[PDB]
Each structure stands twice: as C-alpha cells, then as structure tokens.
A paper describes a structure:
HGbRL from M. infernorum is a putative globin-coupled sensor of 274 residues, consisting of an N-terminal globin domain and a C-terminal Roadblock/LC7 domain. N-HGbRL consists of seven α-helices, helices A–H, lacks helix D and forms a dimer. It displays a typical bacterial globin fold except for a very untypical feature — its helices E and F unexpectedly fuse into an elongated helix. In other words, both the proximal and distal sites of a single globin fold are constituted mainly by two separate subunits, representing the first ever site-swapping example in the globin family.
The structure of N-HGbRL was first solved in the open form in space group C2, with two subunits in the asymmetric unit. In the distal site, an imidazole molecule from the Ni2+-affinity chromatography binds to the haem and the highly conserved Tyr28(B10), which also coordinates a water molecule, W1. The distal site of N-HGbRL is lined by all hydrophobic residues (Phe27, Leu31, Phe42, Leu53, Val56, Val94 and Leu98) except for Tyr28(B10) and Lys52(E10). The A-ring propionate of the haem also hydrogen-bonds to the side chains of Arg80 and Tyr84, and the D-ring propionate to Lys43 N and the Tyr28-bound water W1. A ~ 25° bending of helix E results in a large shift of subunits B* between the two forms, creating a huge pocket of about 250 Å3 in the distal site of the open form that connects to several tunnels. The huge pocket of N-HGbRL’s open structure may be able to bind a comparatively large ligand. In the open form, interaction between subunits B* from two adjacent asymmetric units, Arg39(C5) from one asymmetric unit and Glu47 from the other, causes loop CE to shift relative to that of subunit A*. When comparing their highly conserved Gln(E7)–Leu(E15) regions, however, helix E of N-HGbRL’s open form is moved forwards by about a helical turn relative to that of HGbI, leading to a structural ‘frameshift’ of three residues. HGbI also has a smaller distal pocket which is connected to the solvent through several tunnels, but the distal pocket of the open form of N-HGbRL is readily accessible from the solvent through an opening. When a signalling ligand binds the haem in the closed form, it dislodges Lys52(E10) and pushes helix E outwards, inducing part of loop CE to fold into the extra turn of helix E of the open form.
Numbering used by the authors:
A (entry chain A): 1 to 136
B (entry chain B): 1 to 135
The structure:
Amino acid sequence: MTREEIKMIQKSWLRVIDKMDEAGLLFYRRLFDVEPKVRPLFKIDIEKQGRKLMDVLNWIVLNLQDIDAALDAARELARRHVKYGVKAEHYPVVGHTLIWTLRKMIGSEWTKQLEQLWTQAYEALAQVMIEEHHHH
Amino acid sequence: MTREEIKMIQKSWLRVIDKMDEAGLLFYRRLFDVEPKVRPLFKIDIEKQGRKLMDVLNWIVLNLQDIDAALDAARELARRHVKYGVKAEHYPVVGHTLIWTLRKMIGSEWTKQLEQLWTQAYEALAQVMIEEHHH
Ligand code: HEM
Ligand code: HEM
C-alpha cells in the first residue's frame, strides 16, 4: 500500500475510535446474528465489548504500519536501482538467470522444491521493488 | 514460508558462497548472453563479479529473514486464536462483519476505495493467520 492509502485507513480508524461502544455493540450483534455458533468462543466482560473491538482494529492498523516499515528496505533498494537505470521489465530476466545460476552451482542436489522457494522469494521481492519503480 | 523452508534457502545459499567467484562469472556471462541490452548498466569489473552476485544473494536471504520476523506477530496472534477455538473457516465471516461495522459507523463518508483497502488489509492478515492454523 501507498503511504496515502495507509493514511486513509488510519483516518477511518480514528473516526470509529470516537464511537467505540456503539461500534462494538454493532459488531457482536451482527456477528452473532449471522454466525450464532461462534458465540461461545467469546468469553469477554460484557462491559468491554467496545474496548475489545477497538483492540482488533488497533491490532490490524498497528501491524499494517509495522509491515509497511519492514517493506521499506526493499523499496530503498529499488530506488537505488531506478538510479542505476534498471526498469520494471528487467526483473524477470534477472530472476531466471539467478535461478539458472543456482541450479547450475547446486548441481546434483538441486530440487524442484528449492527452485520453487527461490522463485517465490524472488517474485515476492521483485513485486515490491517493481511497485516502487512504477511510483517513479 | 516455514522455518524449514527458509533453512533450505539458507543452506543452498551457503553452498553457492563456497564457490562464489565461479557463480559470479556464470551469472554475468549468462545475463549478457541472454540479454545484452542491459550490459551497459553494469560497472565493468570482472574480478568483482563474485562479490557482486554475493551482495545480491545476501540481500535476498537476509531480507527474507527480516520479513519472516515481521510476520511473527500475526503468527503469534493466530496461535492464540487456535487456543480460543477459532478455525480457519471463521475468518471470512469475521472480516465481512468487521468491514460491515466500519461501513455502517462511517456512514456517508464511506467509499469503495476505503472498503477495498480494509478488505486488502484484512485478507492479507487472515491469509497469514490461516496458514498458521493449518500447521
Ligand atoms: C485478522 C483477523 C483477526 C484479528 C486481527 C483479531 C484480533 C484479536 C485480538 C487483538 C484479540 C485480543 C486477544 C489477543 O490478542 O489474542 C482477539 C481475541 C479473540 N478473537 Fe480475534 N482477531 C481476528 C480474527 C478472529 C476470528 C476469525 C475469530 C473467529 C470467531 C476471532 C475470535 C476471537 C475470540 C473468541 C477472542 C478472545 C475473546 C475472549 O477474550 O474470550 N478472532 N482477536
Ligand atoms: C530482486 C532483484 C534484485 C536484487 C535483490 C538486487 C540486488 C542488488 C544489490 C544488493 C546491489 C548492490 C548495490 C546496492 O545495494 O544498491 C545491486 C546492484 C545493481 N543491480 Fe541489482 N538487484 C536486483 C535486480 C536487478 C535488476 C532487474 C537489474 C537489471 C539490469 C539490476 C542491475 C543492477 C545494477 C546495474 C547494479 C549496480 C552495480 C553494478 O554496476 O554492477 N539489478 N543489486
């Protein structure tokens, strides 16, 4: 997500934080109306329903911030690459060539599983870096 | 990824390091054979090719470890949910209900964009938690 997209989420969150008791009552009423079977799982103090819903929303937003922070190293790397003249379209050939090289060095003990893991790691990283390229 | 999968990555990585000079040479030779148009992007220094490929592989693996650590909070949360009696099948209805509540509360200021953002955030989180449930 973009810094502004995270900003939009945090604002909507602070909007609800104001009316937390109301939001809490609405959530559980709704959840137990549509899915009455999960009622017994919730052993919360009845006066804290608002607080407990707020804690869920808090958790999501705070964790979203932490993950965004964790992604910043990759965006940093991608910005240096923008400066090197690398473009989004160049990432596949590098990945294939990395994989080609590994498979050749690792030799006999190279597995389809290993190749899948290296591929997943590369594509996931390249996806975040590519997003950064498109911001430029 | 599981810890065991990350270790598999780490182990193959250490193997390449063992002959990093050769891996470097192989890599750049292949890249420029396959895609000569990108050759002008790279600084000319054949003797450093081992080091240069190593920076790349090191970055990938360490960053992979960093991201995996960043996911541990969601996984810890999910482990508590397992103890609470929660099942992977419960995640979609709770997500729908959470976003339904936000939409009702925010009222006229709600937008499709906001709804799509909360959806993306919830689904990405739930996907990590559900993976933990299935272990
Ligand atoms: C991404 C989704 C979810 C998030 C972020 C979330 C967050 C939280 C948080 C922060 C708590 C407070 C206790 C703790 O930290 O362990 C909690 C408790 C709880 N949640 Fe969730 N939750 C999620 C999904 C679900 C789902 C799908 C269910 C299914 C019914 C559920 C049921 C419960 C129950 C039963 C408790 C404990 C209530 C009690 O204290 O008795 N949660 N959740
Ligand atoms: C996920 C994929 C990639 C990773 C992890 C990666 C990693 C790195 C690292 C760690 C460096 C050292 C300098 C620095 O840290 O900024 C570097 C440099 C560099 N990379 Fe990448 N890179 C990736 C993709 C690419 C692609 C697609 C290209 C396209 C041609 C490329 C071309 C370059 C160039 C030209 C340099 C400057 C060093 C030199 O001139 O040899 N990289 N890369």
